[PDB]
Amino acid sequence: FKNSTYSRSSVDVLYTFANCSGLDLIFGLNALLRTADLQWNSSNAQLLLDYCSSKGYNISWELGNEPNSFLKKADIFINGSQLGEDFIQLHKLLRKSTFKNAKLYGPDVGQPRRKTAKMLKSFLKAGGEVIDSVTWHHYYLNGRTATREDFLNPDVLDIFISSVQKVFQVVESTRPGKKVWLGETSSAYGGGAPLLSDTFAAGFMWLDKLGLSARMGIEVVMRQVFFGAGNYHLVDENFDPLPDYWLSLLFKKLVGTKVLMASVQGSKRRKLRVYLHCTNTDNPRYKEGDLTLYAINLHNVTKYLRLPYPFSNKQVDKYLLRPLGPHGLLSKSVQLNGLTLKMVDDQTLPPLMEKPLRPGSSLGLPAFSYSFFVIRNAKVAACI
Amino acid sequence: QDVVDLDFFTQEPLHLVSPSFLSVTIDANLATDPRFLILLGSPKLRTLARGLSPAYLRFGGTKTDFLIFDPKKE
Ligand SMILES: *[C@@H]1O[C@H](CO[C@@H]2O[C@@H](C)[C@@H](O)[C@@H](O)[C@@H]2O)[C@@H](O)[C@H](O)[C@H]1NC(C)=O
Ligand SMILES: *[C@@H]1[C@H](O)[C@@H](O)[C@H](O[C@@H]2C[C@@H](O)[C@H](O)[C@@H](CO)O2)[C@@H](C(=O)O)[C@H]1O
Ligand SMILES: *[C@@H]1O[C@H](CO)[C@@H](O)[C@H](O)[C@H]1NC(C)=O
Ligand SMILES: *[C@@H]1O[C@H](CO)[C@@H](O)[C@H](O)[C@H]1NC(C)=O
Ligand SMILES: *[C@@H]1O[C@H](CO)[C@@H](O)[C@H](O)[C@H]1NC(C)=O
Ligand SMILES: *[C@@H]1O[C@H](CO)[C@@H](O)[C@H](O)[C@H]1NC(C)=O
Ligand SMILES: [Cl-]
Ligand SMILES: [Cl-]
C-alpha cells in the first residue's frame, strides 16, 4: 500500500455527489500520519478541516480504517489506548472548527477476534467519551474461496449473531448505551465473491444482516459498496442496479425505524428467517399501526406462513423478489411479484408494485426467495 | 407439512433504528481512479443514490490510511 494524494477537486466531487443525492458524508481521515513518538500528526487533517470549513461543507469524521491490521498493512502498531488519545485530539480540532458540533465515529475495527476485542475495549476506555457511535466491520466470507452453497447456508448466516454479541459485550463493559454501527459490511471481503456478491444470491445474506442488526440493537448498517470495483457493489460499472440495490430500495420503502420480533413456532427455526418492524409511515399507501414482516426461505420448497391473532384476517400486501432467468440465483436481474425491476429512464425509479393477497390466506414464500409483507389496518399501538 | 405458524411480539418497540439504518460506503480507493469526477458526476448514478436517501455515505477503506490531502494539486 502506497501513499496517494487527493485534491480539493476530489473533495468537491465527493461532497457534491453526497449533497446532490441527499446522503450525509462521513470522511475517514488518515490515522497513519505519526509524530516522532508515535502520536497522531493532525497537521494534514487540519488542512482538510480548514478547506471544508471555507466551503461550508457539513461533514462527519472518522480516523483510521481497521487499525487492528496496521502492523500487517504498514508495519506500524498503534494500540487502542493511543488511538483513543488520537481521537481525543481530533475531537479538540472539530470543537475549534466552524462545525463545532460535527460528529466523530470510530474506531472502524474488524470483527471481534481476541486481538480486535482487546483493541476496541482499550480504545473505548481511552477515547470513548468523544465518539458519537462505535463503528466495527463484518464480512461472512473470503471472496476468493466463497461458494454458492456458503451464500445459502444458515450456519454461515448464524455466525453474525456471535460477532454482534461480542461487540456489545465490549461496549457494555466500557461505554454502556453508546450507539453501535456497522461501519463497513458485505457478503465477502477481498472485493466480494466473483459471480455471487453481485447476484440475487447475495440478497439472503444482505436481508438477514439487516434483520439481525435491527433486532440486536445495531442502529446503522453501512453497505460496502454503493458503487465501485468490488462485485459487492449495489450498482455495476454501467451504473445499472443489481438485485441488492432493488432489495435495499424496497427495504427503505417498507421497513420502519421501530423494531419488533417475529419467530417460527417450530423447533427447527432455521432456513425460515423472519423479521418484524412497524411499517415505514412515510409510505403513502400505509397508515399508523401497520406492520412490515420480511422473510427469507432457504428451504428447497415453498413454505406457507400463517399470521397469529389478531392479524389472521387482515389485508396483506406481498412484495416477493425472485430472479429473472435463465441464471436462477446467479441472476443479476430481479422481478417484484413477477415484474422485472428496471429504471424507467436515467432520472426515474419505477414504482414498486404490491400484490394484495385475499384476506385470511397463508403467506406463500417459494424456495430460495425473500419477501416483505405489509399487514394493513394492523392497528399496533406500539407503531402509532 | 409446509405450513408454519408465526409468533409476533408487538407490545413495544424493542429497538429504534436510525432513519438512515440502511447506509452505504464508497471505498477510499475509488478516489485513485482517474475517472473519479466522471463517475460521481453521472446523472444516472445520482438518481440511484437519491433512491436510498436518507442514508450515510462513508468515504473510507484500507486506502483511508494511505491518502494525503494536498491543497496545491489540480
Ligand atoms: C431438499 O432439502 C432436503 C432437506 O430439507 C428438508 O426436506 C425438504 C423436502 C423440505 O421439506 C425442507 O423443509 C426440509 O427441511 C434434502 O435432504 C433434499 O435432498 C433436498 N432436495 C429435494 C428433496 O428436492
Ligand atoms: C474493508 C476495507 O476497509 C475495504 O477498503 C476493502 O475493500 C477494498 C476495495 C476492494 O475493491 C478491494 O477488492 C479490497 C481488497 O483489495 O479492498 C474491503 C474488502 O473488500 O476487503 C474490507 O477489507
Ligand atoms: C506515508 O507518509 C508518511 C508521512 O507523510 C510516511 O512516514 C510513510 O512512510 C508513508 N507510508 C508508506 C506506506 O509509504
Ligand atoms: C507533521 O507533518 C508535517 C508535514 O507532513 C511536518 O512538517 C510536521 O513537522 C509534522 N509535525 C510533527 C508535530 O511532527
Ligand atoms: C449537518 O447534517 C445533519 C443532517 O443530516 C444535521 O443534523 C445537522 O444539523 C447539520 N449541521 C449543521 C451545522 O448544518
Ligand atoms: C500503547 O502505546 C503507547 C504509545 O506507543 C505506549 O506509550 C503505551 O504504554 C501503550 N499502552 C499499553 C497498555 O501497552
Ligand atoms: Cl490494543
Ligand atoms: Cl472502488
Residue numbers in the entry:
A (entry chain A): 160 to 543
B (entry chain B): 1 to 74
Q: What's the paper's own text on this?
A:
Heparanase (HPSE) is a mammalian endo-β-D-glucuronidase (hereafter, endo-β-glucuronidase) that plays a key role in HS polysaccharide degradation. Humans express two distinct and unrelated β-glucuronidases: endo-β-glucuronidase HPSE falls under the GH79 family of the sequence-based Carbohydrate Active enZymes (CAZy) classification, while exo-β-glucuronidase GUSB is a CAZy GH2 family enzyme involved in lysosomal mucopolysaccharide breakdown. Enzymatic attack by glycosidases upon the electrophilic epoxide “warhead” of cyclophellitol-derived molecules leads to alkylation of a catalytically essential nucleophile residue, resulting in covalent and irreversible inhibition. Herein, we present HS-configured pseudodisaccharides, featuring a cyclitol epoxide designed to bind selectively to the HPSE active site and react with its essential catalytic nucleophile residue.
We also examined the effect of 2′ modified deoxy-, amino- and GlcNAz- NRE sugar conjugates (43–). We further analyzed the molecular basis of interaction between our inhibitors and their targets by X-ray crystallography, using ligand soaking to derivatize enzymes in crystallo. 2, 3, and 4 were all observed to specifically occupy the HPSE active site cleft, with covalent linkages between their pseudoanomeric (C1) carbons and the enzyme nucleophile Glu343. Noncovalent interactions for 2–4 within the HPSE cleft were generally similar to those previously characterized for HS substrates, albeit with a ∼17° rotation around C1′ for the NRE deoxy-sugar of 4 (compared to 2), owing to its lack of 2′ substituent. Using cABPP, pseudomonosaccharide 1 proved to be an ineffective HPSE inhibitor up to 10 μM, while 2, 3, and 4 all displayed nanomolar HPSE inhibition potencies. Effective HPSE inhibition by 4 clearly demonstrates some tolerance of nonnatural 2′ modifications in pseudodisaccharide inhibitors, although the weaker inhibition of 5 and 6 suggests that positive charge or steric bulk at 2′ are poorly tolerated.
